Write a protein that binds this ligand. Structure first.
Ligand SMILES: CC(=O)N[C@@H]1[C@@H](O)[C@H](O)[C@@H](CO)O[C@H]1O
Ligand SMILES: *[C@@H]1O[C@H](CO)[C@@H](O)[C@H](O)[C@H]1NC(C)=O
Lengths: 49, 49, 49, 194, 48, 40, 125
């Protein structure tokens, strides 16, 4: 819940993250909204969406 | 593979309205490249060399 | 404004729809307030997305 | 706009709202088409059970039949379509090592990092001017729909229009409106000899 | 008015496979310029 | 000072519809208006 | 502009039963004048006022017959009945001239039994 500049496993971006009910697949890394922009992130060190 | 799908991903639908649509273009492919220069009849003096 | 806003005074309709025999209810508002819209209207809003 | 069409007939577009019972009203809207006043008072119910059966038939159309509200959608589709087309072009390098800026800076030194960007620009602005010129026009057209409608509500709804094929098919009696998301849909009631 | 319909990859490039391999990164302009031309051919018929 | 308000459409008025009610004027009145339109 | 060309071909050069095309109100005329880079149209019109509540009944009964009007309507003050036009009050006595007959007066609804002066009988007296 803060505007931030982040790097997730080499993926770098800025924005505000939030806890999300989304269900990735055990291998999937990051979802992209239409326009293929970064949509969300499963956080590595706990692998949470 | 089949053209009913040559469209589908053009429109990006797994359904196709009644009606028509347009996908691609036809254009024949060529062959038998040709070159026919003029009568080669003005030569250099090599035998005289 | 040029289309729907011709008048300047907002009128209303009495409860007594003894309007000569017709049943205009299918257009008049719905006091139950499905957004104060009419029947032949609401369809036009849900039948479109 | 309807609370006076029924009630005030059509006197609500020339000044104050003069009432009328909608029977004497149709009794006039017939005097325009070329029908004597009797043909209404002496055949009212048959005229009534027609008007009321005339709507349900429309219910089905707009309650059961899709494809009946096309044009209003062919407008939505475009405006949103070209939009994504603008969102999308932002991943077309337009002639550079990428379509992503922060990287291009984070990989080089200014000099080329400036021309790289000097190209990316030269297509975006071209991307925008394109969308725009596709958004003016489609916003001009929609006007002709409006100055038209504004001339339909002004005539068909607020009164009777003798113009054949303006308030629809037939000697027009009275046209009733209803609204919509981005537009209107009219209910034009007419006369049809049989 | 007469309906025209165009094959961008034919005009800009003229059967030089080299070219088209450049237009892919100049984006999707190629399509639109057609879509706006079909959207004409559909109407200038409707008008008639 | 300043204000922020929802938009007033007009004066809510009601009419006396009835199966036996009409209304007719007795004196007329003229109006003059302006419809400015561009040409050039 | 064309729209502004139609008005000086419809509203100025003539009369048009259309509303909101030659101004607000039942059109009567339209005097135009100029501009630097446009036109102006001065629309003269008809704005009703000084209303009055009346009571209606479309048709009338007499000799068991039903008579209707020709141009205008039927109203009544409390006891009398009169006929006049739809956009002005200048009432008249009902006659066999300003009306006409069709059918029996058992079907029309809202009717009100009345009498009819007829301008021939005394001319026989
Ligand atoms: C200028 C000249 O004579 N060139 C000669 C030619 O005449 C002869 O036919 C050929 C074959 O030996 O060799 C060369
Ligand atoms: C008129 O309406 C009243 C209700 O207000 C009703 O009682 C009466 O029967 C009606 N009569 C006619 C002729 O419309």
């Amino acid at each position: 819940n803060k505007c931030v500049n982040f790097n997730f496993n080499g993926l770098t971006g800025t924005g505000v993250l939030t806890e999300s009910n989304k269900k990735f697949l055990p291998f999937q890394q990051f979802g992209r909204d239409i326009a293929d922009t970064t949509d969300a992130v499963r956080d590595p060190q706990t692998l949470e969406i | 593979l089949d053209p009913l799908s040559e469209t589908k991903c053009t429109l990006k639908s797994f359904t196709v309205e009644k009606g028509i649509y347009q996908t691609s273009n036809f254009r024949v492919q060529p062959t038998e490249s040709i070159v026919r220069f003029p009568n080669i009849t003005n030569l250099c003096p090599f035998g005289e060399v | 404004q040029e289309v729907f806003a011709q008048v300047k005074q907002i009128y209303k309709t009495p409860p007594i729809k003894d309007f000569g025999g017709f049943n205009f209810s299918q257009i008049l508002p719905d006091p139950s307030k499905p957004s104060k819209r009419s029947f032949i209207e609401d369809l036009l809003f849900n039948k479109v997305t | 706009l309807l609370a006076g069409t029924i009630t005030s007939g059509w006197t609500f577009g020339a000044g104050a709202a003069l009432q009328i019972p909608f029977a004497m009203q149709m009794a006039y809207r017939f005097n325009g088409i070329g029908v004597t006043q009797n043909v209404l008072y002496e055949n009212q119910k048959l005229i009534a059970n027609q008007f009321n059966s005339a709507i349900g038939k429309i219910q089905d159309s707009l309650s059961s039949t899709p494809s009946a509200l096309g044009k209003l959608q062919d407008v939505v589709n475009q405006n949103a379509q070209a939009l994504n087309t603008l969102v999308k072009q932002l991943s077309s390098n337009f002639g550079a090592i990428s379509s992503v800026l922060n990287d291009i800076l984070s990989r080089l030194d200014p000099p080329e990092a400036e021309v790289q960007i000097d190209r990316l620009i030269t297509g975006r602005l071209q991307s925008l001017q394109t969308y725009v010129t596709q958004q003016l026009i489609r916003a001009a057209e929609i006007r002709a729909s409006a100055n038209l409608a504004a001339t339909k509500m002004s005539e068909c709804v607020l009164g009777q229009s003798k113009r054949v094929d303006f308030c629809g098919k037939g000697y027009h009696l009275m046209s009733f409106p209803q609204s919509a998301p981005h537009g209107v849909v009219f209910l034009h009631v007419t006369y049809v000899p049989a | 008015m007469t309906k025209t319909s165009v094959d961008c990859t034919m005009y800009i490039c003229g059967d030089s496979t080299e070219c088209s391999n450049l237009l892919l990164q100049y984006g999707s302009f190629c399509t639109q310029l057609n879509r706006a031309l079909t959207g004409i051919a559909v109407e200038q018929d409707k008008n008639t | 000072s300043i204000i922020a308000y929802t938009m007033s459409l007009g004066a809510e008025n009601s009419v006396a519809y009835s199966n036996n009610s009409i209304a007719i004027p007795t004196n007329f009145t003229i109006s003059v208006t302006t419809e400015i339109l561009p040409v050039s | 502009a064309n729209l502004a060309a139609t008005k000086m071909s419809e509203c100025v050069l003539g009369q048009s039963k259309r509303v909101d095309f030659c101004g607000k109100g039942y059109h009567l005329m339209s005097f135009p004048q100029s501009a630097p880079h446009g036109v102006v149209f001065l629309h003269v019109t008809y704005v009703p006022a000084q209303e009055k509540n009346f009571t209606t009944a479309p048709a009338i009964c007499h000799d068991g017959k039903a008579h209707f009007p020709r141009e205008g309507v039927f109203v009544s003050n409390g006891t009398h009945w009169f006929v006049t036009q739809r956009n002005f009050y200048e009432p008249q006595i009902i006659t066999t001239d300003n009306t006409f007959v069709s059918g029996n007066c058992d079907v029309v609804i809202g009717i009100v039994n009345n009498t009819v002066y007829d301008p021939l009988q005394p001319e026989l007296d």
